[PDB]
Design a binder for this molecule. Sequence first.
Ligand SMILES: Nc1nc2c(ncn2[C@@H]2O[C@H](COP(=O)(O)OP(=O)(O)NP(=O)(O)O)[C@@H](O)[C@H]2O)c(=O)[nH]1
Ligand SMILES: [Mg+2]
Lengths: 72, 177
Amino acid sequence: DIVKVAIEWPGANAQLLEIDQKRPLASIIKEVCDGWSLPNPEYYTLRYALYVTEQTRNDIKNGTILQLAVSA
Amino acid sequence: MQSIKCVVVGDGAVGKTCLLICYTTNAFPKEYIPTVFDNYSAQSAVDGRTVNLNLWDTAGQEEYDRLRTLSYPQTNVFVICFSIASPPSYENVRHKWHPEVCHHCPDVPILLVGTKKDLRAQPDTLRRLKEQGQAPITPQQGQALAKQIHAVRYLECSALQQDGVKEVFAEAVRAVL
Ligand SMILES: Nc1nc2c(ncn2[C@@H]2O[C@H](COP(=O)(O)OP(=O)(O)NP(=O)(O)O)[C@@H](O)[C@H]2O)c(=O)[nH]1
Ligand SMILES: [Mg+2]
């Protein structure tokens, strides 16, 4: 299963991605972080523009806009 | 060989997707499936030159309005569409679409496209629009809209009849080439 989303990062142009729901968020976040040349991806989390966790990952609907945010 | 980012926008159901499917495969899809966002890539030769035409399909439903605007940055040319059988989509161009595009991308050429040209003289379309006191959009009306928004060109086409779709994107690349 796949889901289309946009991920925003302040100052940069958003990335329009099709997320593979079989890949861990951690691999997706590392790829998304590379897209904006960001190290230390583990300290980032996707939240709605609420957090996207592995537990709720499948609640995401096509066309939803996510933010790449610095974790707590 | 240069690459051209071409973004197709317009009201929901005006035919932006069928437009891109016809140009890409000459098919015509069975049902209306709203677009979230989709990409097509094609090699096309215009005036003896070849370019990478990267076509970005866009959502016309208001639900995905802000999502649509995230695709805009660095667009080389916009194709703004309205249905010849939907005057409402005709009005939204000059009041909603042209303002929005100009704001996010000033000085980016705009090509104006009247889709579904085959419905201009169909009885069902004529009757329906007649009840509301309107008729299919006229070629003269399209030109007046193109002038008003400074479109580089005004074109009419029909994916269902495979009429003029090729020329639409040949002109998209020309506007920037
Ligand atoms: N008669 C006729 N119908 C057409 C033509 N092109 C598209 N349609 C119909 O118009 C309806 C909308 O088509 P579609 O390409 O999906 O429109 P869209 O602008 O991409 N919609 P969205 O903004 O939701 O993605 C569909 O039923 C399609 O069959 C055409 O040339 N002639
Ligand atoms: Mg569409």
